[PDB]
Enzyme design. Structure first.
Site, PDB file in Angstrom:
ATOM      1  N   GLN B  76      51.494 103.496  80.818  1.00 51.03           N
ATOM      2  CA  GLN B  76      51.174 103.594  79.398  1.00 51.03           C
ATOM      3  C   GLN B  76      50.001 104.539  79.197  1.00 51.03           C
ATOM      4  OE1 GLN B  76      50.526  99.442  78.317  1.00 51.03           O
ATOM      5  NE2 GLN B  76      52.625  98.893  78.884  1.00 51.03           N
ATOM      6  N   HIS B 138      48.008  98.531  79.527  1.00 51.12           N
ATOM      7  CA  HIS B 138      47.069  98.095  78.480  1.00 51.12           C
ATOM      8  C   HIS B 138      45.927  99.064  78.255  1.00 51.12           C
ATOM      9  CE1 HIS B 138      48.315  93.657  79.389  1.00 51.12           C
ATOM     10  NE2 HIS B 138      49.302  94.366  78.885  1.00 51.12           N
ATOM     11  N   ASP B 157      42.612  95.991  78.100  1.00 48.12           N
ATOM     12  CA  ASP B 157      42.054  95.281  79.244  1.00 48.12           C
ATOM     13  C   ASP B 157      42.562  95.877  80.560  1.00 48.12           C
ATOM     14  OD1 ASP B 157      44.618  94.179  79.622  1.00 48.12           O
ATOM     15  OD2 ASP B 157      43.936  92.107  79.657  1.00 48.12           O
ATOM     16  N   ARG B 222      43.120  92.050  74.449  1.00 48.74           N
ATOM     17  CA  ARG B 222      44.097  92.301  75.497  1.00 48.74           C
ATOM     18  C   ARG B 222      44.619  93.740  75.359  1.00 48.74           C
ATOM     19  NH1 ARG B 222      49.486  91.920  76.404  1.00 48.74           N
ATOM     20  NH2 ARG B 222      50.301  91.047  78.390  1.00 48.74           N
ATOM     21  N   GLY B 241      49.839  90.126  72.831  1.00 46.37           N
ATOM     22  CA  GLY B 241      49.399  88.977  73.653  1.00 46.37           C
ATOM     23  C   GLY B 241      50.307  88.939  74.891  1.00 46.37           C
ATOM     24  N   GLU B 247      48.766  89.136  68.008  1.00 45.40           N
ATOM     25  CA  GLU B 247      47.866  88.814  66.917  1.00 45.40           C
ATOM     26  C   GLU B 247      47.747  89.863  65.828  1.00 45.40           C
ATOM     27  OE1 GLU B 247      44.002  88.235  68.839  1.00 45.40           O
ATOM     28  OE2 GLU B 247      44.601  86.302  69.637  1.00 45.40           O
ATOM     29  N   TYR B 257      37.090  88.179  70.421  1.00 43.40           N
ATOM     30  CA  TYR B 257      38.477  87.850  70.081  1.00 43.40           C
ATOM     31  C   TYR B 257      39.181  87.005  71.114  1.00 43.40           C
ATOM     32  CZ  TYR B 257      37.475  90.023  65.720  1.00 43.40           C
ATOM     33  OH  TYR B 257      36.927  90.300  64.488  1.00 43.40           O
ATOM     34  N   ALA B 263      44.314  82.909  73.927  1.00 49.24           N
ATOM     35  CA  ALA B 263      45.419  83.662  73.376  1.00 49.24           C
ATOM     36  C   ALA B 263      45.755  83.123  71.986  1.00 49.24           C
ATOM     37  CB  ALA B 263      46.664  83.525  74.261  1.00 49.24           C
ATOM     38  N   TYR B 265      45.211  81.300  68.576  1.00 46.68           N
ATOM     39  CA  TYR B 265      44.265  80.248  68.189  1.00 46.68           C
ATOM     40  C   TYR B 265      43.713  79.504  69.390  1.00 46.68           C
ATOM     41  CZ  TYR B 265      46.710  81.001  63.798  1.00 46.68           C
ATOM     42  OH  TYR B 265      47.286  81.570  62.683  1.00 46.68           O
ATOM     43  N   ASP B 267      43.892  76.629  70.633  1.00 46.18           N
ATOM     44  CA  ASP B 267      44.700  75.445  70.378  1.00 46.18           C
ATOM     45  C   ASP B 267      45.279  74.779  71.613  1.00 46.18           C
ATOM     46  OD1 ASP B 267      46.535  77.313  71.115  1.00 46.18           O
ATOM     47  OD2 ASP B 267      47.538  77.491  69.188  1.00 46.18           O
ATOM     48  N   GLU B 303      42.069  76.644  76.919  1.00 52.55           N
ATOM     49  CA  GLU B 303      41.378  77.365  75.846  1.00 52.55           C
ATOM     50  C   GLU B 303      40.189  76.549  75.347  1.00 52.55           C
ATOM     51  OE1 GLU B 303      44.814  77.964  73.209  1.00 52.55           O
ATOM     52  OE2 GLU B 303      44.960  80.023  73.925  1.00 52.55           O
ATOM     53  N   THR B 342      57.118  86.609  71.508  1.00 50.50           N
ATOM     54  CA  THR B 342      56.249  87.690  71.119  1.00 50.50           C
ATOM     55  C   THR B 342      57.050  88.770  70.383  1.00 50.50           C
ATOM     56  OG1 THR B 342      56.556  88.565  73.355  1.00 50.50           O
ATOM     57  CG2 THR B 342      54.384  87.633  72.827  1.00 50.50           C
TER      58      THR B 342
HETATM   59  O1  LIG Z   1      55.549  90.008  75.591  1.00 48.63           O
HETATM   60  C1  LIG Z   1      56.455  90.894  75.600  1.00 48.63           C
HETATM   61  O2  LIG Z   1      57.666  90.543  75.513  1.00 48.63           O
HETATM   62  C2  LIG Z   1      56.111  92.262  75.693  1.00 48.63           C
HETATM   63  C3  LIG Z   1      56.950  93.349  75.582  1.00 48.63           C
HETATM   64  C4  LIG Z   1      56.478  94.669  75.611  1.00 48.63           C
HETATM   65  C5  LIG Z   1      57.398  95.763  75.571  1.00 48.63           C
HETATM   66  O3  LIG Z   1      58.470  95.725  74.951  1.00 48.63           O
HETATM   67  O4  LIG Z   1      57.210  96.827  76.149  1.00 48.63           O
HETATM   68  C6  LIG Z   1      55.124  94.889  75.732  1.00 48.63           C
HETATM   69  C7  LIG Z   1      54.360  93.696  75.854  1.00 48.63           C
HETATM   70  N1  LIG Z   1      54.809  92.432  75.856  1.00 48.63           N
HETATM   71  C8  LIG Z   1      52.954  93.753  75.972  1.00 48.63           C
HETATM   72  O5  LIG Z   1      52.216  92.612  76.094  1.00 48.63           O
HETATM   73  C9  LIG Z   1      52.316  94.969  75.970  1.00 48.63           C
HETATM   74  O6  LIG Z   1      50.936  94.952  76.073  1.00 48.63           O
HETATM   75  C10 LIG Z   1      53.056  96.148  75.838  1.00 48.63           C
HETATM   76  C11 LIG Z   1      52.669  97.448  75.756  1.00 48.63           C
HETATM   77  C12 LIG Z   1      53.806  98.221  75.577  1.00 48.63           C
HETATM   78  C13 LIG Z   1      53.979  99.592  75.451  1.00 48.63           C
HETATM   79  O7  LIG Z   1      55.115 100.092  75.581  1.00 48.63           O
HETATM   80  O8  LIG Z   1      53.077 100.376  75.224  1.00 48.63           O
HETATM   81  N2  LIG Z   1      54.895  97.404  75.560  1.00 48.63           N
HETATM   82  C14 LIG Z   1      54.423  96.119  75.720  1.00 48.63           C
HETATM   83  O1  LIG Z   2      55.866  91.693  81.368  1.00 43.47           O
HETATM   84  C1  LIG Z   2      56.247  92.061  80.071  1.00 43.47           C
HETATM   85  C2  LIG Z   2      55.578  93.311  79.522  1.00 43.47           C
HETATM   86  O2  LIG Z   2      54.213  92.762  79.608  1.00 43.47           O
HETATM   87  C3  LIG Z   2      53.240  93.742  79.158  1.00 43.47           C
HETATM   88  O3  LIG Z   2      51.967  93.101  79.355  1.00 43.47           O
HETATM   89  C4  LIG Z   2      53.286  95.032  80.038  1.00 43.47           C
HETATM   90  O4  LIG Z   2      52.350  96.050  79.600  1.00 43.47           O
HETATM   91  C5  LIG Z   2      54.691  95.632  79.923  1.00 43.47           C
HETATM   92  O5  LIG Z   2      54.824  96.685  80.909  1.00 43.47           O
HETATM   93  C6  LIG Z   2      55.628  94.553  80.440  1.00 43.47           C
HETATM   94  O6  LIG Z   2      56.952  94.980  80.358  1.00 43.47           O
HETATM   95 CA   LIG Z   3      42.477  86.912  70.216  1.00 43.55          CA
HETATM   96 CA   LIG Z   4      53.292  90.533  75.716  1.00 43.97          CA
HETATM   97 CA   LIG Z   5      46.180  79.601  71.866  1.00 43.87          CA
END
Ligand SMILES: O=C(O)c1cc(C(=O)O)c2c(n1)C(=O)C(=O)c1cc(C(=O)O)[nH]c1-2
Ligand SMILES: OC[C@H]1O[C@@H](O)[C@H](O)[C@@H](O)[C@@H]1O
Ligand SMILES: [Ca+2]
Ligand SMILES: [Ca+2]
Ligand SMILES: [Ca+2]
Ligand SMILES: O=C(O)c1cc(C(=O)O)c2c(n1)C(=O)C(=O)c1cc(C(=O)O)[nH]c1-2
Ligand SMILES: OC[C@H]1O[C@@H](O)[C@H](O)[C@@H](O)[C@@H]1O
Ligand SMILES: [Ca+2]
Ligand SMILES: [Ca+2]
Ligand SMILES: [Ca+2]
EC number: 1.1.5.2
Lengths: 446, 444
Positions: B76, B138, B157, B222, B241, B247, B257, B263, B265, B267, B303, B342
């Site tokens: 990324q 990230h 992060d 995150r 998340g 969020e 945050y 992650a 709330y 909670d 949490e 998510t």
């Molecule tokens: O929780 C998920 O199902 C999911 C999917 C994806 C995704 O589709 O690439 C990302 C993430 N999480 C994610 O946490 C994340 O930080 C992320 C970054 C990216 C990106 O392409 O730049 N996809 C995703």
């Molecule tokens: O594991 C699910 C997705 O989680 C995100 O945290 C990662 O950046 C993505 O590369 C990954 O596909």
């Molecule tokens: Ca937060």
């Molecule tokens: Ca995610």
């Molecule tokens: Ca929580």
């Protein structure tokens, strides 16, 4: 937020404050205010009395007794709202709300009194708004005057959909038709925050609900007993939830706070809306499982299935739990409810510091708890837009805290306690032996 | 909020707009802006190219290609941050952030370029802030100029505590010592919102953390890929998340945050912090169950057990679930994650309406979803203090929506789609067959 443990509550003793009981055995003391004469003024919900107390001597004077106040021994009705006009020195008025018999069995009336300095008493009563709903449960009744010189008033859901009013249909979501409004039929004025002109009329700029402008400012409330403006003009609030999800809210014009379709966040967690008024018959029991588990015949709607609009979530919940939570915990004996994940907030006070401000209390909201025997301190950011961290318990004791204020210098807190009721002890067990029955207590920062 | 179902996403087709592909040959298009010249400018993350598209005709020019941009095919990283100076006519500067090799393997650099209208290119590069953390995961990288004329930059992060960086200690909660600053050591600049002077220096009025004022504005993030100022000066944000709790946040000076200890709330529902850096078994595997269930050996913190300060909860979570949730959903066969609760928000855009404003879109925040193939419309009150109701999905398609903007008039939306990747189809299954790979699509 996640519930605190009996042990975390127990350790919140506030050894940094000196406690001095000014009065005891008051008759259901309800609201207290720092007076324009720099004296403590407080109400007795049960008797209709307005007392003025000298902070130094504890000396009490019964300044006035609101006539014909109706109160049930087993009810939350009686004398409720109480505020002074912001510019008292020039507008010597006292605003109240009370349970009175409805000639047309009770009604709630919002009324103004004129204070007479020369006779030291209240006079020239003017009913600003009458015919308001009335019951023995969830009356709310907090009354404040905003920076906009309007009256803000909380009116509860009247206890519908639980206990003795189990099968009456909750109206927290309902608003008036222009017809009801024209006939001064305020039956929909339940579970609301009202905004009214100082004369009782409808502010032309009040929000519009389903095509009508009424006294309603916000809707979808259960029992909001706390209401307080911040220095920057925002409106903070505390509200009692059912078996869970008491709330801290920010009140915004035209907002819908979700009750009863939603308790706390719209998360389908630990609560569901069981509409007993729609149940197949009035013989089914309320399992008292917060709608998560209900008896056959009652329609249940998930928070996520509700179709209302302008839903505004709370800033903080006390507390939110999951569906697996046990609402029947055999630790609170026959008083199960005391073990429910709630704190029963009875008021809400914006701490404004002063020349002797308490260290670290900037932008805090003080929220007294009935059933936990603590006063919570809740921090916000300097713009009062969000809370920071959690609700911190203070002054733990076998008492039901009902209201709290601070002196102008900020180093002394004045609190009211309930005359009777159940409170949770240091070990999570239930007691109806209150250490300071119906008292006015003073906490001085060491 | 509670997750929508495959069928609820499936139905968000928005039969009320007309789709029209403007460009389709893009390589990992990432950011897109409405330019001060009334053209659409967009970036290619892998190539470092900055393109300008005529919104009317669709003619495109490669205005500049940022040299030596580093990008891993499986990452990324690349060209990230992209913004114009608010008074472009008088200050023709373009601000970017990009992954570059670190001579002292990569670093992130926030850099300024001067735009030359007569030659229509960028020149006179100035490194405002260099030596920022960099990794393949990230990175975040949203770069905006606030009403205070400061640069606000999100820096992720770095993916620590998951996947390839599983055993690295997450720094989202860490802040620099006055000694690290003095030394221009920005290793703690992970999972933050930075606030910089236009020359890269530390704003004298930045918040203080553990005794020092650094570029850090907020911490405990995150992967915040969305950042947008509202018309009354508030800062809205979107953030990825883990298996839950994406969020929508309101960014306030000095706020924490919560990541990674919290992650969504606070909670204790559906997530717990399992700190792999602290496990003794570098042998330990990640069960990928969001901390709810973990292999023996790794320390877990609830949490509610975290001892944080100034914790600020989200305005909205997408989404929150209970501990009884199953993160191993078969509907998603091999790509189990897609079925996680998510939405993977890739940006955040404040809808400003205009002369042809979409009815009822007043005070809305638009949030594109990568994994769900929708654009969410999130309503706020007129003071941008609270959200109203839920996140309403729009334009459902088998595409990974990466960014979104609106024309000055307010009746056309422009979106970018990813070149490749997985997306949830109408019936829950995952497909890597995207309908409009790396395109600039317009919705009228
Ligand atoms: O929780 C998920 O199902 C999911 C999917 C994806 C995704 O589709 O690439 C990302 C993430 N999480 C994610 O946490 C994340 O930080 C992320 C970054 C990216 C990106 O392409 O730049 N996809 C995703
Ligand atoms: O594991 C699910 C997705 O989680 C995100 O945290 C990662 O950046 C993505 O590369 C990954 O596909
Ligand atoms: Ca937060
Ligand atoms: Ca995610
Ligand atoms: Ca929580
Ligand atoms: O959930 C609870 O455990 C609990 C306790 C109490 C209480 O102790 O009085 C109240 C409530 N709930 C409550 O919902 C409520 O509206 C309420 C009002 C009052 C009051 O005395 O005026 N107590 C309580
Ligand atoms: O059931 C627990 C408590 O619930 C509240 O809603 C009622 O007003 C109280 O009378 C009751 O004790
Ligand atoms: Ca309750
Ligand atoms: Ca509510
Ligand atoms: Ca709820």
């Amino acid at each position: 937020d996640v519930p605190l443990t009996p042990s975390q509550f127990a350790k919140a003793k506030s050894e940094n404050f000196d406690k001095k009981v000014i009065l005891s055995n008051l008759n259901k003391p309800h609201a207290l205010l720092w007076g324009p004469d720099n004296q403590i003024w407080l109400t007795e919900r049960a008797t209709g009395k307005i007392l003025r107390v000298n902070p130094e001597s504890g000396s009490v004077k019964t300044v006035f007794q609101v006539p014909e106040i109706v109160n049930d021994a087993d009810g939350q009705n009686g004398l409720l709202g109480f505020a002074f006009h912001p510019d008292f020195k020039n507008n010597p008025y006292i605003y109240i709300s009370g349970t009175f018999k409805n000639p047309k069995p009770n009604q709630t009336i919002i009324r103004r009194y004129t204070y007479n300095k020369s006779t030291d008493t209240l006079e020239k009563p003017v009913d600003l708004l009458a015919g308001l709903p009335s019951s023995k449960d969830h009356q709310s009744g907090r009354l404040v005057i905003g920076p906009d010189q309007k009256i803000y008033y909380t009116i509860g859901d009247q206890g519908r959909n639980q206990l003795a009013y189990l099968f009456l249909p909750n109206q927290a979501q309902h608003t008036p038709t222009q017809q009801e409004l024209n006939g001064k039929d305020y039956h929909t004025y339940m579970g609301k925050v009202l905004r009214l002109n100082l004369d009782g009329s409808i502010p032309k700029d009040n929000p519009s609900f389903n095509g009508v402008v009424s006294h309603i400012y916000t809707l979808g409330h259960r029992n909001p007993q706390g209401l307080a403006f911040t220095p920057n003009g925002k409106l903070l609030q505390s509200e009692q939830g059912p078996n869970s999800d008491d709330e801290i809210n920010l009140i915004v014009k035209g907002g819908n706070y979700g009750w009863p379709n939603v308790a706390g966040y719209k998360d389908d967690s630990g609560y569901a809306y069981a509409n007993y008024s729609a149940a197949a018959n009035k013989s089914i029991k309320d399992l008292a499982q917060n709608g998560v588990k209900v008896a056959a015949g009652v329609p249940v709607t998930k928070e996520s299935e509700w179709t209302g609009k302008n839903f505004v979530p709370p800033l903080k919940t006390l507390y939110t739990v999951q569906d697996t939570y046990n609402y029947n915990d055999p630790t609170c004996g026959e008083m199960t409810y005391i073990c429910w994940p709630t704190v029963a907030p009875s008021s809400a006070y914006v701490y404004k510091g002063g020349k002797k401000a308490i260290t670290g209390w900037e932008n805090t909201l003080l929220v007294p708890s009935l059933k936990r025997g603590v006063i919570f301190r809740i921090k916000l950011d300097p713009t009062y837009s969000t809370t920071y961290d959690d609700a911190v318990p203070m002054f733990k004791s076998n008492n039901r805290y009902r209201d709290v204020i601070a002196s102008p210098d900020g180093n002394v807190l004045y609190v009211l306690t309930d005359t009777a009721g159940n409170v949770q002890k240091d070990d999570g067990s239930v007691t109806n032996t209150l250490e300071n029955p119906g008292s006015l207590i003073k906490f001085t920062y060491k």
